[PDB]
């Protein structure tokens, strides 16, 4: 009945907004401190805000149905039609996207294959390229269930159609800021990440993408609020909270020493106190440990530089 965390070293966990395990762990006051993320969100109560999916493989991968037309563009842009990954159709609602849909502007590079149903089938793969940021003349609109993805100057002449699946592979001109979910109108989203007390700087698990550029690659750092095992844990257990905070201690594993005290709030994040100027990283082999509940404002044991 008492709440609890998994006994798993953060270096052994999946991620939330890009399917690749966690590498770093760092706090930062400099970067924007008011992210409005959608993927990887959960109430320790047990519900699922935003578009947060359940599995790990359902991150930024949308199913659809393909169909083309040759009038404008030009591109030879395709035209998908969103349905939920399980197979059942999709009708708009509270969430601003199907389950598991990207939430970061830029220019993705998806990889699309034919949905499989039984052995001995025939498959076709391709490599499209879409835009998610605030770009006009190709009005993007997942909320209705309609996206516009171009085609790359590459292997071709037998494209795909029918029932597809779109796993991502790359990025271009990354810009962490929510895409245009509806065509400019409003959609029922998840609240900002907050609020915060003088002496508050969110804790960010950090993984590295692959950022294509002019004939070279370059890693790029992207964050989340919690690894995916936390989501799969909470959403399956459905505990019951007392007030708002839940103070933890990031305990090392060999010695038994301490590294900070982190106020795991109720609304799904792990705040902290750090009054430095630059960034600051922490080792990534420790373990989390539940200690107690408390109120919101339980003063912090600041672990600074």
């Amino acid at each position: 009945r008492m709440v609890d965390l998994p006994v798993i070293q953060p270096r052994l966990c999946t991620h939330a907004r890009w399917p690749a395990p966690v590498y770093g762990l760092l706090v930062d006051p400099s970067l924007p401190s008011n992210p409005q993320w959608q993927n990887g969100r959960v109430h320790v109560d047990g519900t699922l805000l935003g578009t947060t999916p359940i599995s790990g493989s359902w991150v930024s991968c949308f199913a659809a149905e393909a169909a083309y037309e040759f009038q404008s563009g030009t591109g030879e842009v395709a035209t998908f039609t969103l349905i939920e990954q399980d197979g059942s159709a999709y009708v708009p609602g509270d969430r601003a996207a199907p389950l598991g849909y990207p939430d970061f502007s830029g220019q993705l590079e998806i990889e699309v294959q034919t949905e499989t149903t039984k052995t001995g089938d025939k498959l076709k793969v391709t490599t499209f390229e879409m835009i998610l940021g605030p770009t006009t003349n190709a009005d993007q609109a997942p909320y209705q269930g309609r996206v516009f993805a171009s085609v790359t100057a590459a292997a071709s002449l037998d494209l795909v159609d029918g029932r597809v699946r779109a796993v991502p592979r790359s990025i271009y001109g990354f810009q962490d800021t929510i895409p245009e979910y509806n065509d400019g109108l409003l959609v029922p989203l998840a609240p900002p990440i907050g609020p915060f007390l003088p002496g508050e700087v969110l804790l960010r698990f950090r993984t590295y993408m692959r950022q294509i550029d002019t004939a070279d690659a370059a890693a790029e750092a992207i964050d989340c609020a919690l690894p995916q095992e936390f989501v799969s844990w909470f959403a399956s257990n459905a505990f019951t909270v007392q007030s708002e905070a839940l103070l933890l201690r990031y305990r090392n594993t060999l010695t038994g020493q301490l590294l900070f005290e982190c106020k795991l709030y109720n609304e799904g994040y792990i705040a902290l106190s750090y009054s430095g100027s630059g960034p600051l990283t922490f080792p990534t082999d420790g373990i989390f440990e539940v200690v107690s509940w408390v109120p919101r404002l339980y003063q912090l044991a600041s672990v600074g530089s």
Epitope: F70, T74, E76, V151, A153, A155, S156, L157, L159, D161
Partner: antibody, heavy 118, light 107 residues
Amino acid sequence: VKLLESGGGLVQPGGSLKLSCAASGFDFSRYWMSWVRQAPGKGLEWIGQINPHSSTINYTPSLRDKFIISRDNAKNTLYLQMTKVRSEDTALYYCARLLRYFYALDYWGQGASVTVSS
Amino acid sequence: QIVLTQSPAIMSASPGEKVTITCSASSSVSYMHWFQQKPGTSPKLWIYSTSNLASGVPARFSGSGSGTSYSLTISRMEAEDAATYYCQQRSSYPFTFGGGTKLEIKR
């Protein structure tokens, strides 16, 4: 969305020629291309097709060894090369802007007239 | 290596009538296209995937058929429907055009 050709003229048997189909008004470095010919009288005839990367190039089985298709993205043009031309291979030559899913050669140029002569 | 046959080679009619044109197949195919070449002019795409209309055609025309025999039919002819019509198949092999038939005015 406008094309053009050059190189039409006179050649002798066994000779060689370089037709240049130029394009304008669209992303020429993204679409496949193809060539088809019409002898005076008889119906159309397919030559082949070339993708943008020059990766794969499909020729008709016959008369492969006499035709060399290629392109250039920088100067934004397309080249067809005839070698050891014979007398029977005089016709009009068109360069089409083939399409992706439904193959559908849609936009055609103007016409290159090629005639062997003595 | 599929060869096609268009029939008949040349045939005419008078406005207001309905005509049909068949382009048969020597083997199983799955789609055909239709082009229209007025004399002294580069051809133009007319009907793709055996059933759809190109960009800028009057809605008189009609494409149908399936299996190994397709055909193109007009509802009512006109004075702007006189040109050679070619059938192409994008099925499986080095593509092939049909022999091509003509369709002109009857006076």
